[PDB]
Design a protein around this motif. Structure first.
Motif, mmCIF file in Angstrom:
data_model
loop_
_atom_site.group_PDB
_atom_site.id
_atom_site.type_symbol
_atom_site.label_atom_id
_atom_site.label_comp_id
_atom_site.label_asym_id
_atom_site.label_seq_id
_atom_site.Cartn_x
_atom_site.Cartn_y
_atom_site.Cartn_z
ATOM 1 N N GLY B 7 0.692 -1.195 0.144
ATOM 2 C CA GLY B 7 0.092 -0.054 0.021
ATOM 3 C C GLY B 7 0.892 1.243 0.149
ATOM 4 N N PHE D 11 4.616 -8.510 0.022
ATOM 5 C CA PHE D 11 3.288 -8.716 0.439
ATOM 6 C C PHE D 11 3.349 -9.956 1.364
ATOM 7 N N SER D 19 -2.339 0.451 9.372
ATOM 8 C CA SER D 19 -2.789 0.800 8.066
ATOM 9 C C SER D 19 -3.822 2.072 8.393
ATOM 10 N N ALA E 13 -4.705 -13.140 7.516
ATOM 11 C CA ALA E 13 -5.286 -12.827 5.976
ATOM 12 C C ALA E 13 -5.401 -13.813 5.056
ATOM 13 N N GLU E 53 -8.863 -4.950 7.863
ATOM 14 C CA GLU E 53 -7.795 -4.741 6.956
ATOM 15 C C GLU E 53 -7.829 -5.349 5.576
ATOM 16 N N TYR E 54 -8.024 -4.747 4.438
ATOM 17 C CA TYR E 54 -8.231 -5.317 3.197
ATOM 18 C C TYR E 54 -7.194 -4.954 2.391
ATOM 19 N N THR E 55 -6.198 -5.951 1.896
ATOM 20 C CA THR E 55 -5.097 -5.733 1.011
ATOM 21 C C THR E 55 -5.180 -6.284 -0.281
ATOM 22 N N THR E 100 0.285 -3.551 -4.683
ATOM 23 C CA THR E 100 -0.963 -3.746 -3.906
ATOM 24 C C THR E 100 -1.145 -2.622 -3.114
ATOM 25 N N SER E 101 -2.496 -2.401 -2.613
ATOM 26 C CA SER E 101 -2.882 -1.448 -1.838
ATOM 27 C C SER E 101 -3.339 -2.104 -0.449
ATOM 28 N N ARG E 102 -3.652 -1.315 0.549
ATOM 29 C CA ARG E 102 -4.059 -1.563 1.828
ATOM 30 C C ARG E 102 -4.791 -0.498 2.488
ATOM 31 N N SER E 104 -8.011 0.225 5.857
ATOM 32 C CA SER E 104 -8.633 -0.440 6.990
ATOM 33 C C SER E 104 -9.779 0.138 7.585
#
Lengths: 168, 197, 155, 54, 155, 54, 155
Positions: B7, D11, D19, E13, E53-55, E100-102, E104
């Motif tokens: 991210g 990752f 986050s 996860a 938390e979405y990754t 990737t993005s992340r 919460s």
């Protein structure tokens, strides 16, 4: 008590009093609208200072009184809108529910016949070239016409120092 | 010595962050004292506004020679119906969960010699609206003599919507149509939780 | 009850202007009245004072981008070989196509608050000489102050 | 002045990290006292259960 | 004995949803009941409270991705030129394809815990105008609280 | 452990920042007392100049 | 009144030189008199002392760039296979094409201030052996000191 005297003027209700022309509230009238200080541009000494000085600053006290008997019905909403958008001392003879957000004072002939609103100077600059608009709307229609008198008292008024400044 | 985690270089619209100025070393136009500063949105939804219940759509019509009949009746769903255009229902449209107590008020505008007794009945959430003066009088209610008091202010209980109606107990005694004006606002215990578009 | 605060109600990033450049230029006079979802919430207050954060996103389709801010009262670029682009007084940001830039203009006005008012203008070009790039600018109002609640507009 | 070391932008599913929130400045539905809170899984395997022996 | 804790047992996860976009869009209503290996461990408790938390991982095959979260009770996008995508109220993240993005999301519910319940929805598009991208979203339950152990499901 | 936020590697002309020297470990020509040092531009606009009026 | 300070009035990044290299070289003797918008503000003071910050931007069109600084009194490169490029005494920066480099030369002079004066020279090449790159150098005057206000030039 009931005889407020301001300067060379005296009024009975419950810096001078400028009484605009008395309007006739007939049963079919939509209301009236007066932009300030435009309603006073022709009003004697204030109209002279307002034209002579380039910039100015003034507060107002508006007394709206409707001389009538204790037999009439209906209610007017007297509301002052700062910076209203799309006349002189004659006004503009004419959603509404939301107008209560603005400073207001319903006159209801059943109970009351006077409304007094003390308006401070409201602007995005401290001084300005001579801004607010008073509206009178008959909400509940008049059942038995009745006269409406508007009295504006400009107070705590200051004007620019230029044209009075010495260059030495 | 550092390692970039997942991210990185992402653009979240709701991520509030500090940033460099385009034009630094600039003193902007000073702050003056303008009256009526709005610090929270919850303090302007608290002011009374007219309800478009019926200019003619804000006037609740009252007529002579009618007894045990209904003047008006409404649901209290602040999201839709008569409340949609009011300041309260036009700002509850920007939030998903509105939870709290309300202030409902009325004013009579007929002549000073006129009189009637009107009953303002509140039906709590989950129940069915009344179809008789007896049903209305038996439940929560305020008997209101119009001649004696020009204005009646109700305070609806805590809700998270119920029904509210008015009935003629006595016919209107007109001296030898008249109107009620209804107003709505929210008490200081009214919350507003999740934003919408 | 943090969501009723005016920094929570008005201070959130929305897409205010979307344009497209070629390899020539586009200038947008800043007006938050163009987005009717932000204007409907902002035009219930007469006066409002707020700094700003502009986050510019550039995406290509078939490179460097020079998004230059222009202070109130300064001329806008008219071509893609003008002298305004090389001018030192007006700020600019040079970022690669595909990612995003972010800057923060202070409260630029003449009166102590905007009355819903010269915010300035942004001009966009691609610097390479001898592809279509889509520019999305997201504005976020910062340190907001409101002062006269108005009736909400119905029409 | 910093230098990115090996394993940057990787990752790992088991890497527990802080986050940014999608929707910040939101107060979520309050916590009430529900009885029988399970703090550890080792405390519910300790209860007798029938054996399907026959 | 740290592996018997409910943050160790449930808070890890896993791949909850896998979709594919084209250069148009896909929306998934969030339901952790779709993954039978996470549902089998989560449906032995009646009530459960947890943040998230979405990754999101995006990979191409033959670019920018706008993964927008949609709060409970808000409409989902229906096309790839809708107004929901430009809407300020719903959060979104713009990241390049291949990394990737992340983000919460906090505990979004109406009751004090979910009973195995409106978590919201995620909508995915690729922003470029005029390639097939595979999107894998990994969810991790955070600050979990459980409250009534049930019999484990056999069928 | 860090994450790069939006607007990374951008070049703002008005962003005043520290930078490495091309030639470090060099002592430059000393500072001498020249009279009439202009500290602010607002102090030289205050001097009378003729007006080209005619 | 921070904008009337001489670090605010003269200390801002402007485009001082723009050249183009091929895959051979270009050397520019540093002279801030080439930009008439910076010379018009700087030639109202007789003497001026300032350090410097050079931000070099390289963009391609149809790679590594070696922007080497050359101290006052040192020879400039004459070809693209010269020995000046390999020389240790003259500083150099190697950056990829498309982004930007940034360095900061100290006050290099013989007198205690420049009189509007040998600032040195910058030479630019692309290192790859066996595309046209546009180089824009932006100079920002640092820690400025001015000392005799002159009449502004009219012609």
């Amino acid at each position: 008590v009931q005889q407020i005297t301001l300067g060379n003027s005296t009024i009975t209700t419950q810096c001078r009093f400028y009484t605009l022309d008395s309007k006739t509230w007939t049963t079919g009238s939509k209301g009236w609208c007066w932009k300030l200080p435009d309603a006073l541009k022709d009003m004697g000494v204030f109209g002279q200072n307002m034209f002579f000085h380039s910039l100015g600053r003034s507060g107002y006290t508006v007394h709206v009184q409707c001389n009538a008997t204790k037999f009439h019905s209906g209610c007017l909403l007297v509301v002052v809108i700062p910076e209203h958008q799309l006349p002189g001392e004659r006004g503009i003879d004419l959603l509404l529910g939301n107008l209560l957000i603005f400073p207001h004072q319903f006159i209801n002939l059943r109970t009351n016949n006077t409304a007094t609103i003390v308006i401070p100077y409201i602007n995005s600059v401290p001084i300005d070239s001579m801004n607010v608009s008073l509206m009178v709307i008959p909400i509940a229609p008049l059942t038995v016409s009745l006269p409406i008198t508007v009295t504006i008292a400009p107070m705590c008024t200051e004007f620019s120092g230029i044209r009075s400044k010495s260059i030495v | 010595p550092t390692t970039t985690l997942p991210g990185s270089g992402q653009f979240l619209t709701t991520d509030d962050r500090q940033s460099p100025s385009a034009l630094p070393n600039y003193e902007p136009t000073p702050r003056i004292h303008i009256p009526g500063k709005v610090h929270n949105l919850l303090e302007i939804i608290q002011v009374d506004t007219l309800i478009p219940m019926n200019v003619n759509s804000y006037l609740i019509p009252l007529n002579a020679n009618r007894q045990n009949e209904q003047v008006f009746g409404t649901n209290l769903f602040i999201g839709d119906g008569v409340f949609k255009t009011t300041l309260l229902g036009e700002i509850v449209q920007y939030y998903t969960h509105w939870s709290g107590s309300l202030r409902f008020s009325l004013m009579y505008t007929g002549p000073a010699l006129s009189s009637a007794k009107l009953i303002l009945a509140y039906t709590p959430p989950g129940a069915r609206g009344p179809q008789d003066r007896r049903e209305a009088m038996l439940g929560t209610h305020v008997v209101w003599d119009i001649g004696l008091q020009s204005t009646i202010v109700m305070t609806i209980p805590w809700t998270s919507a119920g029904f509210l109606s008015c009935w003629y107990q006595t016919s209107l005694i007109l001296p030898p149509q008249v109107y009620l004006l209804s107003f709505i606002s929210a008490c200081p215990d009214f919350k507003l939780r999740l934003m919408k578009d | 009850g943090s969501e009723t605060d005016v920094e929570c109600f008005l201070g959130r990033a929305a897409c205010v202007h979307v344009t497209e450049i070629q390899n020539l230029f586009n200038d947008w006079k800043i007006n938050l009245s163009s987005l009717v979802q932000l204007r409907k919430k902002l035009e219930l207050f007469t006066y409002v004072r707020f700094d700003s954060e502009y986050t510019i996103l550039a995406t290509a389709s078939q490179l460097v981008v020079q998004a230059m801010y222009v202070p109130p009262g300064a001329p806008n670029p008219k071509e893609w070989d003008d002298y305004t682009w090389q001018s030192a007084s007006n700020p600019s940001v040079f970022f690669k196509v595909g990612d995003t830039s972010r800057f923060s203009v202070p409260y630029v006005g003449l009166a102590s608050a905007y009355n819903c008012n010269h915010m300035g203008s942004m001009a966009f070009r691609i610097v390479n000489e001898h592809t279509l790039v889509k520019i999305r600018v997201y504005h976020r109002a910062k340190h907001v102050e409101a002062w006269i609640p108005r009736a909400p507009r119905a029409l």
